[PDB]
């Protein structure tokens, strides 16, 4: 159940012969390419001096 789109159909229907039609095998989602942690530019630095 991982090499062909047909094989996932055979695997979801649990049959080796898949009848004519459209079958929702699985679901996909484009994954986060990266993480964007964003905050306001520093505005109140402390005067250690």
């Amino acid at each position: 159940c991982a090499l062909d789109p047909l094989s996932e159909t055979k695997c979801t229907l649990k049959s080796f012969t898949v009848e004519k039609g459209i079958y929702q095998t699985s679901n996909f989602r484009v994954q986060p390419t990266e993480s964007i942690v964003r905050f306001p530019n520093i505005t109140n630095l402390c005067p250690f001096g």
Partner: protein, 49 residues
């Protein structure tokens, strides 16, 4: 006036109940065949409409 069709919605647990949560995902598959049933129920509705 007569209603005929309905909005062909389709849920996906592994994204609805929790997205980008693999620990929730395998916790879901511990529950079993609830969600393959729900997608089956809603695709049955969608084909019906």
């Amino acid at each position: 006036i007569l209603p005929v069709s309905m909005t062909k919605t389709s849920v996906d647990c592994t994204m609805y109940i929790c997205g980008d949560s693999t620990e929730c995902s395998n916790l879901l598959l511990q529950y079993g065949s609830f969600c393959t049933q729900l997608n089956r129920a809603l695709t049955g509705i969608a084909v019906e409409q």
